[PDB]
Design a protein around this ligand. Structure first.
Ligand SMILES: NC[C@@H]1O[C@H](O[C@H]2[C@@H](O)[C@H](O[C@@H]3[C@@H](O)[C@H](N)C[C@H](N)[C@H]3O[C@H]3O[C@H](CO)[C@@H](O)[C@H](O)[C@H]3N)O[C@@H]2CO)[C@H](N)[C@@H](O)[C@@H]1O
Ligand SMILES: NC[C@@H]1O[C@H](O[C@H]2[C@@H](O)[C@H](O[C@@H]3[C@@H](O)[C@H](N)C[C@H](N)[C@H]3O[C@H]3O[C@H](CO)[C@@H](O)[C@H](O)[C@H]3N)O[C@@H]2CO)[C@H](N)[C@@H](O)[C@@H]1O
Ligand SMILES: NC[C@@H]1O[C@H](O[C@H]2[C@@H](O)[C@H](O[C@@H]3[C@@H](O)[C@H](N)C[C@H](N)[C@H]3O[C@H]3O[C@H](CO)[C@@H](O)[C@H](O)[C@H]3N)O[C@@H]2CO)[C@H](N)[C@@H](O)[C@@H]1O
Ligand SMILES: [Mg+2]
Ligand SMILES: [Mg+2]
Ligand SMILES: [Mg+2]
Ligand SMILES: [Mg+2]
Ligand SMILES: [Mg+2]
Ligand SMILES: [Mg+2]
Ligand SMILES: [Mg+2]
Ligand SMILES: [Mg+2]
Ligand SMILES: [Mg+2]
Ligand SMILES: [Mg+2]
Lengths: 182, 142, 59
RNA sequence: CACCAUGUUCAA
RNA sequence: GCGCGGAUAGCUCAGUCGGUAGAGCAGGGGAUUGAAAAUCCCCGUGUCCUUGGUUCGAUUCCGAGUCCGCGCACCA
RNA sequence: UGCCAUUUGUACACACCGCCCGUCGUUGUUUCCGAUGAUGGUGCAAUACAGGUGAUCGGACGAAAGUUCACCGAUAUUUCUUCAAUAGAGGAAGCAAAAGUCGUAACAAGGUAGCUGUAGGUGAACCUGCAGCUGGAUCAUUU
RNA sequence: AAGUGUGGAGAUCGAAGAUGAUUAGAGACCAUUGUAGUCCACACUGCAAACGAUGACACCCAUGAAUUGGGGAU
RNA sequence: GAUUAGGGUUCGAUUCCGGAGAGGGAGCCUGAGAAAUAGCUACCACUUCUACGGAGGGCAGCAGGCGCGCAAAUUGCCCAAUGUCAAAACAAAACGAUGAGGCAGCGAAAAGAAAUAGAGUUUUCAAUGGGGGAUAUUUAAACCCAUCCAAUAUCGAGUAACAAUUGGAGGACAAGUCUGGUGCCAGCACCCGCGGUAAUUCCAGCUCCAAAAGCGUAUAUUA
């Protein structure tokens, strides 16, 4: 009862659950990025909505204000750090132009497809969740892992994975047992 | 011709609004106690009751059927009400002297369309769910 | 008479429904692979009628 | 300026 | 308390003063209607308290007796 | 008897074979009145009064038992007040339901123009008297 | 306006009521009547389509006939 | 807290702060502090043991129990941590008490992350969880998670049967002029409406749509 650990909600369901324009865009986003459900889109809506709302508050504030120099250089920093904005985009008006496919390109499911470690985007989500990709010699099993810019150089196969330098996986190993009893 | 300004006219505006909120049938129902003392459920939902008798309530014009519904007497306050039994069949799952779990249906106690004067609904009979008996997920005890 | 329905006629149509059984039909993929199956048919395999029915007695 | 009342239930 | 009285289909009910049964509704099916309502036709149908005396035979006669109403009573 | 055009009124729209009002019957519901019946708390203040506290005496063995008085006061009982619930012969009002009865009040100058107020009459819509109104069937006729 | 109380008045119209008639019925319209009322005094009531279905007080606001009362020029 | 452009409209028994109460109502003692209730005295309402003389009760503490309801868990393990008390550091024959408080069991209140497959030429190749288990690790002890199937030496997917559901398909509102049945019946339908023998709406089969380890419904409440 006396537990003060915090928790909040990360996604929000849309108003108007049957919009034929919206339902067609989100089925493209579930196909082009290999997503499980519409809720994984909807947290990328709320992630980007909160960036689009704070950056629109800071432009109400003048320049050489304390809450715009601090904390406006923080939101441009995390866009440059996670690959949301390339380094030319530094004016804070580019956060207001970010889209949901700009955030979905930074998921570990997408880079493992774009770096070339997997044939399809549904090949990438299997290999993450089946413990094959290490970001910095750290096995990451989360597909919604947002990859930073500095982490792109070091994505490879895991050192414990059978595809890397680890022991052979199940279908070879249970076949290597069946050839052993004979 | 409507309202008053004046920088010191707030007591007039506070009194003016508190009387005109009583004309709002949502504000008046949320702030008077005839709302719950006459509600057959005690200002709550899903009250239990005992089935007394089966009624066939004929539908309103332009429809024409008889709606299969039971009259139940609630346990929490002993109020006799008539409640509808939803689905094809389903008075075959209700006998007299059965405990039934009765919710409203729809419109905050305002008699969903065809059925005249019935504003409650059977949810669960003999502590097993009535829609589970229809789809034959499970069957009645005893 | 005035009324043509009775409490004795309860469940008339559901009793005389002819009781067809469901067929075998191997399982569809679940979860992320079912969204892959939705996307490939409505986009990659080219008004757009999502459930077009074969011609019946209306023409 | 005599009298001149009424047409069942849904539906098209 | 005595007397006058009435019981015939699921119900309701008319009777030749002493020879065996009338309808109607409720029911099941048709005609009708765009489907109904009404409407018309056709279909199930009443051992008549219990019975005696038994007219060739008691429903119809008379008297006994369940049923259910009605006329009328301590004595100054 | 019908048809065509114009004007005007309409609550009509499968369109006057239209729409529609009240009483009365049948069924179901929620209120209200009503002799009478009755329940749970408050407040008011009236006595009775358990205990204790303080005081006064007491003094078995300094100090227990016990006196007496004052005070705080539970509880009991009664008196009205007040709030919230509740049974009732009978008498009503309202509402809701497929096609029962009686008329026809309103909508057209709805066949007595409608309607407001009031007063009295009537099975029932309603009629009648008086003064208003047009939301009228007239924006108009001693220049 | 109807209504009420107490006094007057009481011509005419006239709720109630009564007779005629119309009608399937007529408790209505129409005809003949006729009570309360109508009218006055003093009390009471305070219920209107009490309307312009338009709260009061200021401000600004284009045009052409008129009209009522006051004032000023000819 | 919920919702909110702005102004607002609501909820706050509930973890922190304060106030109040310990079955109702009093009155006290002791103490620095109580009008204390796992203190006392009394009455009222219930109430347990008795050998009838008498003696006791107070879970709005934690587990539980019966009722009441639409409605809420284990008569669990431990002081290892956080603290409190105190004659008290720990250790040494020699472990202070703690239903405070942790820990675990139940637990779709609500929240995070996430499987139910991938890849290729009928036909194969790779995967790794769910799950079984340890030289062990966690833990106060277990559990969980995490790590692991040799380090000389560790089990395992194919219908991957290890099988996704809940509500819909006239309109709003995304998705069938499909087939069978019933015939203003049965039922559906929040609202509009469906159903009267060719039902886009009922009962079903197919096929689709939506959200998805979730999804209907009811009552409050904000937009
Ligand atoms: N008339 C009855 C109506 O029913 C409602 O009751 C409930 C449901 O009908 C309704 O459920 C709706 C669902 O119908 C609709 N198809 C989608 C919507 N997401 C659901 O909403 C519900 O589910 C989501 C989960 O995503 C929950 O997060 C959300 O809080 C909850 N409201 O949400 C309500 C929560 O249970 C209203 N409570 C009631 O006020 C309203 O009157
Ligand atoms: N508790 C008082 C009771 O009221 C009763 O009176 C009942 C009736 O007099 C009265 O009549 C109502 C009436 O209000 C309303 N205007 C019409 C409604 N149909 C009537 O209803 C009554 O009559 C019908 C029979 O036609 C019944 O079906 C119905 O159940 C019954 N309540 O409604 C009352 C009940 O709702 C009886 N007098 C008696 O039982 C007792 O006085
Ligand atoms: N319901 C409350 C009131 O009832 C009155 O009227 C009610 C009745 O007098 C009226 O009766 C009508 C009648 O007009 C017409 N002449 C014949 C019709 N059969 C009747 O109908 C009534 O009875 C039958 C059962 O018999 C019901 O199925 C029907 O729904 C009901 N309306 O129907 C109305 C019931 O809804 C008032 N006229 C009305 O102001 C109000 O609705
Ligand atoms: Mg591994
Ligand atoms: Mg008639
Ligand atoms: Mg006519
Ligand atoms: Mg005449
Ligand atoms: Mg005269
Ligand atoms: Mg506290
Ligand atoms: Mg008490
Ligand atoms: Mg407890
Ligand atoms: Mg069909
Ligand atoms: Mg279907």
């Amino acid at each position: 009862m006396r537990n003060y650990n915090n928790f909040n909600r990360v996604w929000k369901a849309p108003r108007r659950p049957f919009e034929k324009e919206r339902l067609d865009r989100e089925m493209k986003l579930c196909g082009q990025y290999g997503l499980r459900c519409k809720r994984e889109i909807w947290r990328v809506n709320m992630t980007l909505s909160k960036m689009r709302r704070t950056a629109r508050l800071l432009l109400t504030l003048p320049e050489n204000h304390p809450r715009r120099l601090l904390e406006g250089s923080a939101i441009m920093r995390r866009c440059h750090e996670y690959g949301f904005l390339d380094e030319e985009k530094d004016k804070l008006d580019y956060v207001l132009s970010l889209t949901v496919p700009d955030i979905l390109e930074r998921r570990l499911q997408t880079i493992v497809f774009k770096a070339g470690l997997a044939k399809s985007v549904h090949h990438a989500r299997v290999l993450i969740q089946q413990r094959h990709i290490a970001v910095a010699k750290q096995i990451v099993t989360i597909p919604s892992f947002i990859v930073r810019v500095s982490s792109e150089r070091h994505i490879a196969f895991a050192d414990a994975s059978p595809f890397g330098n680890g022991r052979p996986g199940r279908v070879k190993r249970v076949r290597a047992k069946a050839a052993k009893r004979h | 011709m409507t309202k008053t300004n004046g920088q010191n006219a707030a007591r007039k505006l506070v009194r003016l609004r508190r009387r005109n909120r009583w004309a709002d049938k949502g504000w008046k129902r949320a702030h008077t106690f005839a709302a719950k003392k006459a509600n057959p459920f005690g200002g709550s939902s899903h009250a239990k009751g005992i089935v007394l008798e089966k009624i066939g309530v004929g539908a309103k014009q332009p429809n024409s059927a008889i709606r299969k519904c039971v009259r139940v007497q609630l346990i929490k306050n002993d109020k006799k009400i008539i409640a509808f039994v939803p689905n094809d069949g389903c008075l075959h799952f209700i006998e007299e002297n059965d405990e039934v779990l009765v919710s409203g249906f729809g419109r905050s106690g305002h008699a969903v369309g065809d059925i005249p004067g019935v504003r409650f609904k059977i949810v669960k009979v003999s502590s097993v769910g009535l829609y589970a008996l229809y789809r034959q997920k499970k069957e009645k005890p005893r | 008479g005035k009324i043509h329905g009775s409490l004795a006629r309860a469940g008339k149509v559901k009793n005389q429904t002819p009781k067809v059984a469901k067929q075998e039909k191997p399982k569809q993929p679940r979860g992320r692979a079912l969204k892959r199956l939705k996307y490939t048919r409505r986009f990659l395999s080219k008004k757009v009628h999502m459930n077009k029915q074969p011609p019946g007695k209306a023409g």
